[PDB]
Symmetry: C4
Subunit: 388 residues, 4 copies
């Protein structure tokens, strides 16, 4: 086994094709399925695995009540092969209400945060063993990506924030080798608030596209230079913006360095990446809430804060169906690195009062250099008919 | 791991021996089992896998109501080892209301079609990743085999159809190397309508025996040449025809070039293969309905359209129980390529109104050069006793 | 991977140590467990597998009614790693209401029989593909061992019977190389009725201890020469006799060549093996019924038929508890071949009328050259409480 | 594949990081989970496994009543990958009401004990086959570690006891090569009563921290020389003692050689290990019943029976919640050997009478040389809302 260098060009992309659906909730009206949230996908060199933070309970289960809650000691990171839904034989790989995993070509790294809000613990687990742990530095909800980390030449990076959800917070980038935190750069550049980054390998370094929970409804970018541990940061220029909430298509605007100050509060995890001076991005369809899910290309949207020219729209989930978190992952082809993404399909509380639980299912698309059509692929469960 | 070439002669066949039964429905009365239809069987160099098209629901499950429906955004392609019923630990390999799959000696190809009726998308998945996709070309229910594809020297082939189900349609044959659509030949020859081909290797090409849904109760044949991509086609000469509905044995007739025009409309997926000038074929035992299942050799049935001389019959499913789709697969023996087939045993709606769902189980026989006896192997669930 | 030769001295045995137990019936009151009968154990070079004949149903399932029946089309051979109870992810490896399996060092052979009572088919499955089959020869319930077969230098041997359960039946021994029947030898020597042979390797031959459903309460021995395919047969001399029914310890007697004629009608599958001129053997504790199980050694039990001198008695299952079929299998130690055995633990109809089903769990013991104690390991379910 | 030698220095330990939690009781409220007690953790070179002792029943079952009982013939030793809950497809690896396991580099070894209280039997199962067995010597409950054994150069040591739980009793140390009992030295030194040892490699020997159930709330230490098979023994010096029950912190005293005589009756399985002349150790928070769980470092606590200076306290389970047995396991890193530990979270009878069953879940923590914070990880099920 050799370490992944990811030293290949990005695959040509014309949009994304259908790849996976798990049907989790539909399956839990007549099965034993875990209650989850903040799912994501990552792949070893052969195949892809789906992750989630469980709630330490199944759905048809009295312990399902009040699983809207985001941190409990009973939360663990679930790991299955992609498209094997989270059944009772599912492996909980570490204790965590916040997590990030990646495979460096030789083994899996997992980053797992659990414990008190003010004194949380991050564990670093590699080749099935604990190798390290750092402590919460600002004492306010140590948290990480909720999607895959990236590993170049055996050096894996992960972005972590401790701090205010609504003011300056303390963001750091760790560099992990065979499970050991070898360096710790602190955030730099113009990004003013950073959360749940969707990172991808852009040789010779790593690029991430994040959530700004404070004053931006445009999206932070982070460059990460893997050799000298340096960081620069900014915002996704595209005048069509990827956070939720945000203003409508006619009003909005963006900046290449600063938060647009537009409904900037709150947000949703999301993803975008670059194709020359253009930008591929996904986002919710509804501008203020977590309904529907679209991707597209904005022409010159990577390098022009004034561009609002989308081509290649694809509806993933239609505006009548709930979406949620979403992130990126990278798959290595014979000739190129492909970009793929997942979409958390949230059901239940607080938005849906037909039940007492909160959970998700998931849908995964992958870039293609070929052709595709339309469709829609929601969660498809009926809550009025669900275990009451 | 070298590519499969299948460059061994077809095994001496005196008939078929019992190979596999999954018992899916009876089990789903006392366990959480997937609702499925359109199963098939394919096998890697070491062992055999069963596939099927899930309904994103288990049987004892409120979402099972209405699963008679062909295309939903929740249908996914399920894959287990042969004889492992579709339990909740079953992997979904892609989103699909129409698929095919083959292993090429090195890795699995899946051809998965999902999306809108008028704008379907086919994804091509190889060695664990999306490598390609085509849109619907005629915008009228893009569909493929519902059984194994075939790969020789690392080029795999699949047959797809877009367009009318009761008039001329647009059938193409795709050639695929490591998940990459490398050529697209268009259908040619006498065959006038084509659906759901059951293809076998037959060095140095591939042979398919399909379903004409338009004016044929005789079955289409499709020859595929692999090195130059040329396609010819015709019908199965035998005067005892393989489709359902059809005319009875005294009344029916056939042609080697055109459809026969006898109850030709509609159909069922089925299979045949040649042995010199003789034809082995399975079919249903009722003329108009998917009841029972039989197999036999029609002597000179591959090259004389008047021949109705059948020998070596066997009742696979007795005339009073339910059959359905049926297809071939080829298994590489020590000295020869053998031929086997599964039979979909469809139960429930709309033919059976004791329940609200529609599902299948399966039985599998394999070619034998040895000896054998008689029996019947239906689904054997009581729908009078099933889930509410 | 080399073939098994089994060419090592047989291990020293002082009695048997506990090895495995599946508590299947106990689990089936709070889980989905297969209904089975006629279980057995066979090991690959690395580890053991547990086998059984299914009823195409789990226990908490409406279809479990009249699982007393011994031949339906819904019966399959189930195969798990030893210890892993028959849950829904259990593989059904072939269609069988009578089976025998065994690993030759390179791959598994399975010998499965299904079909009509008067025309059944035995399928031979090797390295995951169908390689041969044979028709019933006497048209009267073709059956086989219901426990492991034995393979030497890549030649496997299995004993099958077809014919009357209460008169002269037609017993044959097959030699199967890589799934292919290379020879069929008919039964020879002095044994007058043969069924359900528990066979073990004994370099260079194979040897089997069987059941006489006809006139014997002593046990047929069959002896198979693997190179020149010769058969002899006789009975287990021991005045202590292993079949059930039988006369009591004081009243019973035996014979080295003929059936004792003492309560010979009916029987049970059991086992024995030589230890110089002595015999180790198991049997039900009760004379006329399938209650309790015991093993002991009988000094000069292999060669002198007047001997009734037992020693090293062990109670495996106490006399107030149900037992059943039992059979031998051999595990290869570093320097010698060990000998182990399984006791079927039958619960349900028609002996126990509290429930409508008929199922079993199992317990497994292995030869030791060490010291051991006492105990009793029954099935331990309470049927006064099981489903309905 | 070479034997494990464990010939690396012990890793720096500043404390413990969260590693795994299995949430077994909460899951059993809506899913089929085994009833277990006396769980523990051991790892092959690649990955860890959670073992436990099954009550031969799942939780939602009639057979779960009276699982408070310690020894029945339905108990088996369960084995899953760490973080995979004891679901229906979990392997039962041998019959055991008391057990121990280690991997020696090449394969697994299981020491399992079952049978009559006064004539128990212990089976030694190595690389999937029974290699040995010894009877109960003092005919008063042969029992063993209930946590991992330890192997060095392919020789495994395990500690067993036969005799009184409140008096002199007979402890022995077995030395096992590939499942073969090669030698047996008996207990020697000032250790007066020894049970349930939590052992760990300490090249070139093995050391163990045990339970004294007779006169000592300090914990026996046992040192095992692997080369001359010689045994010394004593007690953990630290003034804060590891047993439950015990006196409070201002009353407690120890002794390096003899039992303290302080509420010395009864006990709980627990662990400690040396770090220079300091000791690392865990224990229940509450001094007299199994409530809460804590770990800390005692400065000079390994060598000075007067030292009561603890540093680095961590609460694993808060004092409102239930703990139980806890043991140690060792994990080989690149440079050094890490120490880890599990905690049993016992729920139900006798202490809690809302339900009729007794079962557990586990939480697991690992040595770290990095940093950490606080938290509490109880079992977290609601027995009020549990199955009747
Ligand atoms: C089968 O499926 C295919 C593939 O998904 C569909 O083709 C896509 O259709 C979408 C939707 O129309 C296209 O996305 C849109 O592109 C527009 C640009 O289109 C033209 O204009 C420019 C500039 O003059 C030309 O250069 C270019 O060649 C085009 O002719 C954008 O304007 C769209 O954005 C606007 O529309 C959406 C609604 O669609 C609004 O909600 C937005 O806010 C915005 O106002 C959008 O980006 C996409 O490019 C097509 N892709 C491909 C590869 O063909 C087929 O339509 C479908 N077939 C059927 C029968 O449904
Ligand atoms: C035990 O199991 C074996 C194996 O399955 C059975 O043997 C098979 O039996 C079937 C059914 O009879 C045979 O198939 C039939 O072949 C007929 C050919 O007739 C003759 O063929 C030659 C010479 O002509 C002779 O060798 C032979 O003796 C025959 O007399 C076909 O005409 C049959 O088709 C017609 O009948 C069926 C109903 O049976 C109709 O439904 C058809 O539409 C059609 O009108 C039929 O195909 C088969 O060849 C046998 N195989 C072998 C290997 O022997 C035994 O039947 C079974 N035994 C018992 C006692 O149950
Ligand atoms: C702890 O566990 C061990 C191992 O299981 C037990 O020791 C075994 O005890 C059994 C039962 O008594 C023994 O089996 C019996 O052997 C007898 C041999 O006769 C004597 O001769 C030998 C050698 O000459 C002497 O060493 C010895 O003293 C014997 O007395 C047979 O005669 C017995 O058969 C009769 O008894 C049984 C039931 O008791 C009847 O059902 C039969 O029909 C028959 O009439 C019997 O076979 C066995 O050999 C012992 N094994 C070993 C290895 O020593 C301990 O008993 C047990 N301890 C406790 C307290 O339970
Ligand atoms: C975030 O997370 C970390 C990690 O858990 C916490 O830091 C630990 O805090 C605990 C609890 O206080 C510390 O353990 C305690 O250590 C005392 C040491 O005494 C002093 O002396 C040293 C130098 O000799 C100084 O460095 C230190 O500042 C101390 O003043 C022990 O004496 C304590 O034992 C007594 O208290 C406990 C209750 O705490 C009683 O139950 C005992 O019986 C006894 O009376 C105690 O064990 C631990 O050392 C810290 N570890 C580290 C690495 O710093 C943070 O507290 C936490 N932050 C927040 C805000 O929660
Ligand atoms: C269990 O099986 C028996 C036998 O199949 C069932 O009893 C038979 O039911 C049929 C149709 O209802 C009757 O015509 C017969 O008279 C019955 N036969 C016998 C031998 O009794 C019985 O109903 C089944 N039990 C359940 C609960 O379904
Ligand atoms: C569901 O839970 C509601 C809110 O309960 C709160 O959160 C839970 C997890 C507990 O910690 C509890 O003490 C809190 O009050 C309840 O009001 C409601 O009764 C529950 N519903 C059911 C059906 O149990
Ligand atoms: C079962 O469904 C019946 C009709 O189904 C209709 O079409 C499909 C696509 C469903 O999604 C459904 O919502 C539509 O109404 C219903 O009329 C009937 O009430 C249903 N029965 C039960 C028991 O739920
Ligand atoms: C639960 O069990 C109680 C105690 O009975 C004991 O345990 C069972 C398993 C048997 O071995 C019995 O002979 C023992 O005395 C019962 O007294 C009680 O009723 C049981 N409760 C229920 C609900 O079944
Ligand atoms: C967009 O939002 C603003 C609300 O601030 C509104 O004035 C404007 O008309 C909206 N435009 C459209 C096209 O919805
Ligand atoms: C956004 O979401 C809410 C959900 O209640 C809906 O009522 C509103 O109309 C949506 N608006 C748009 C423009 O999609
Ligand atoms: C077959 O059925 C049709 C009825 O439409 C008829 O042409 C013919 O007479 C039938 N043949 C036999 C043998 O019944
Ligand atoms: C075919 O099936 C139908 C439906 O029950 C039946 O009524 C009919 O008689 C069958 N036809 C023949 C020829 O057996
Ligand atoms: C054995 O059975 C016979 C009946 O044939 C009876 O007379 C005798 O008492 C029995 N002997 C023993 C030892 O049970
Ligand atoms: C067998 O059971 C019967 C009662 O059904 C009993 O009388 C007979 O003696 C039993 N044999 C033994 C050895 O217990
Ligand atoms: C410890 O636990 C016991 C058992 O319930 C309880 O009575 C007692 O109050 C506790 N003691 C302390 C000091 O917390
Ligand atoms: Ca925002
Ligand atoms: Ca259930
Ligand atoms: Ca047709
Ligand atoms: Ca008999
Ligand atoms: Ca004590």
């Amino acid at each position: 086994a050799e370490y992944r260098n990811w030293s290949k060009p990005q695959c040509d992309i014309t949009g994304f094709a259908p790849f996976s659906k798990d049907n989790s909730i539909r399956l839990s009206a007549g099965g034993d399925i875990w209650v989850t949230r903040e799912p994501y996908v990552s792949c070893d060199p052969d195949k892809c695995y789906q992750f989630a933070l469980g709630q330490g309970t199944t759905l048809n289960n009295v312990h399902s009540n009040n699983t809207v809650r985001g941190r409990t000691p009973y939360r663990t990171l679930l790991m299955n092969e992609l498209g094997v839904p989270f059944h009772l034989g599912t492996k909980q790989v570490c204790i965590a209400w916040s997590s990030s995993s990646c495979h460096d070509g030789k083994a899996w790294l997992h980053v797992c945060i659990t414990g008190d809000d003010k004194n949380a613990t991050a564990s670093f687990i590699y080749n099935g063993r604990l190798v390290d742990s750092v402590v919460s530095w600002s004492k306010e909800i140590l948290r990480t990506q909720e999607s895959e980390c990236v590993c170049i030449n055996g050096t894996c990076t992960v972005v972590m924030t401790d701090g205010s959800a609504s003011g300056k917070a303390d963001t750091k980038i760790l560099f992990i080798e065979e499970g050991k935190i070898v360096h710790t750069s602190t955030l730099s550049g113009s990004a003013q608030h950073v959360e749940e980054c969707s990172c991808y390998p852009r040789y010779p370094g790593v690029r991430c596209v994040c959530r700004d929970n404070w004053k931006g409804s445009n999206r932070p970018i982070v460059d990460i230079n893997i050799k000298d541990h340096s960081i620069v940061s900014s915002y996704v220029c595209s005048g069509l913006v990827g956070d939720t909430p945000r203003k409508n298509d006619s009003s909005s605007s963006s900046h290449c360095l600063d938060p647009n100050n537009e409904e900037g509060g709150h947000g949703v995890k999301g993803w975008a990446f670059d194709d020359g001076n253009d930008v591929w991005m996904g986002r919710t369809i509804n501008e203020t809430s977590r309904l529907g899910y679209e991707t597209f290309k904005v022409i010159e949207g990577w390098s022009n804060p004034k561009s609002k020219l989308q081509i290649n729209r694809q509806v993933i989930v239609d505006r009548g169906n709930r979406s949620g978190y979403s992130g990126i992952f990278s798959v290595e082809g014979k000739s190129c690195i492909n970009r793929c993404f997942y979409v958390e399909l949230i059901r239940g509380r607080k938005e849906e009062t037909e039940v007492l639980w909160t959970s998700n299912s998931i849908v995964v698309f992958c870039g293609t250099s070929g052709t595709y059509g339309t469709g829609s692929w929601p969660d498809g469960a009926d809550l009025n008919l669900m275990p009451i």
